[PDB]
Structure 1
Amino acid sequence: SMLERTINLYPLTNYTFGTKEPLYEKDSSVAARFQRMREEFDKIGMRRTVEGVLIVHEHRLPHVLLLQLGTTFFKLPGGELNPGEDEVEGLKRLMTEILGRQDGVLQDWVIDDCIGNWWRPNFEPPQYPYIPAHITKPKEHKKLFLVQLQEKALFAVPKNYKLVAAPLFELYDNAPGYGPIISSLPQLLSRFNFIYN
C-alpha cells in the first residue's frame, strides 16, 4: 500500500551556485523561435524537448530549482534533443551544458522518473498534457523528468541566468507567473514520498 516512489531531498544550503559565461538563447524573439520551429519541422519533423525537475528543501519545505533569464521568464533546465538522441542521455547532456562546472568535473545526474508529457499542436504558444483532437502532426513533444540530486553539488549558473528555488505554493495555480507546465509541478510532484535529509 506504499506505492509511492521515495526521493531524497537535501537542504538548498548543501549546494554551491557558482557563475560562468552567459549561455545565449538560439532564438532572439518569439517570432524567430516559431520561424526556426517551422524550418526544422520541415527538415526533421516534430521537435523533441526534455526538461529536468530538480528539488531541494529548506527546513522541510520542498523547492523546485528554476532558471530565470535575467528578471524575465522562468525555465526548467533542459532543451532540444538532436535527431536519434536518447531522451535521458540528452537531458544529461543539456543539464551539463547549462549547470556543468568550469573545472569540468562531472555531475552525477540520476534520472529514473518521468513526471509528464506536453504536446504543442501548432507553431504557437499553446501546449497540452495530451495530443488535442484532430492533431495528427504535433509540432513539439516535451518530456519532463525528475532529477535526483546528490547530497552536495557545485553548479555553475550562466551569468545571464539566476538559479531560483521556488516553493511549491508559489507555483500552484500561478500559470500567469510560470505558465501551465511549471504551475502544475505541485500536482505532478504530490505522488512522491520526499525524505527531508
Structure 2
Amino acid sequence: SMYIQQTKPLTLERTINLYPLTNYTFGTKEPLYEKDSSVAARFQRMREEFDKIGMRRTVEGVLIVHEHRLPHVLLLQLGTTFFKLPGGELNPGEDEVEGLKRLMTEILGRQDQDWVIDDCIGNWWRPNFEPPQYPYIPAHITKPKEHKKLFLVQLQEKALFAVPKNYKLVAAPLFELYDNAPGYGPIISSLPQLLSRFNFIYN
C-alpha cells in the first residue's frame, strides 16, 4: 500500500523527544561553591588567567522537558535569584563536548549515566573584562576574553540527578524566559529563539 519515503536531512529538520517534567527527579550531593565571591573579583581572576592561559572557554548545557506540551528548560538556582545552566570552564587542552560531559556530571551526576550532546545551539563572546556579552564577535575585537558555547543535551525518558546542596534544580517555561534578561540574563532569556528551530515531540 504505502510508498517508502526519505529521510529529511537533520539540518533542515532536527527532531527532539521531550518527556513529562515529573519523569525527572533529584537527590542531594555535597555543596559546590563559587570560585569567585563578587563581580569585581570575577573579572580580576578572568584577567589574571587571560594573561597566563588566554581566552576563557566556557560550555553550557540546555536540558529540555515538557509539562502539558509546553517546553521547559532545566535551570540551577543558587540562593533564590541567581539562575544558571549546568556547565562551566573548560581546561586549556580540553575538547568542548568531553569537557561539558565532565561538568554535566560534576553538577548533576548521580553517585551510582552518559550525556547525549550532539547539537550546538549558539555562541556568545565577551570582548572585555566586563558583563556585556554578544552572539557575535564585535567589530575590531581581535582577542575576546571569553568564548561561551551552548549545546542541547538530550535526556532519556527518565532521569535521577544529584544536585549540590546549595543549589536547587528548577524548570522554566519558554514564555517566562522570553524577553526576560532581568530574571534570567541575556543568554538564558534568548533560549526561546535559540530553541525555536527544533521539532519537539511531546511524549
Q: TM-score, normalised by structure 2?
A: 0.93
**3-state DSSP of counterpart to 2:136:** coil
Q: Runs ≥4 in structure 1, deviation > 2 angstroms?
A: none
Matches within 5 A, 1:1-197: 3-103=12-112, 107-197=113-203
**3-state DSSP of counterpart to 1:8:** strand
- What whole-Å deviation, never above 9, does each CA across 1:17-67 have from its counterpart, x for those lacking one? 111111001111111111110010000100000000000011111100010
CA distance in 1, matches of 2:114, 2:90: 20
CA distance in 2, matches of 1:16, 1:65: 11
Which is higher, the Rg of structure 1 or of structure 2?
Answer: 2
- What whole-Å deviation, never above 9, does each CA across 1:121-171 have from its counterpart, x for those lacking one? 000000000011111110000000000001111101111111110000000
Q: CA deviation at 1:15?
A: 1.1
Larger deviation, residues 120-129 vs 24-33: 24-33
Residues 118, 128 of structure 1: 8 Å contact kept: yes
Gaps (5+ residues) in structure 2?
A: 1-10
Q: CA deviation at 1:108?
A: 1.8
CA distance in 1, matches of 2:128, 2:43: 9
Gaps (5+ residues) in structure 1?
A: none
CA distance in 1, matches of 2:92, 2:158: 33
What is the alpha-carbon root mean square deviation over aligned residues?
Answer: 1.0
**3-state DSSP of counterpart to 2:99:** helix
**3-state DSSP of counterpart to 1:186:** helix
Q: TM-score, normalised by structure 1?
A: 0.96
CA distance in 2, matches of 1:70, 1:4: 38
Identity of aligned residues (%): 99
Residues 108, 150 of structure 1: 8 Å contact kept: no
Q: CA deviation at 1:72?
A: 2.3
Residues 117, 144 of structure 1: 8 Å contact kept: yes
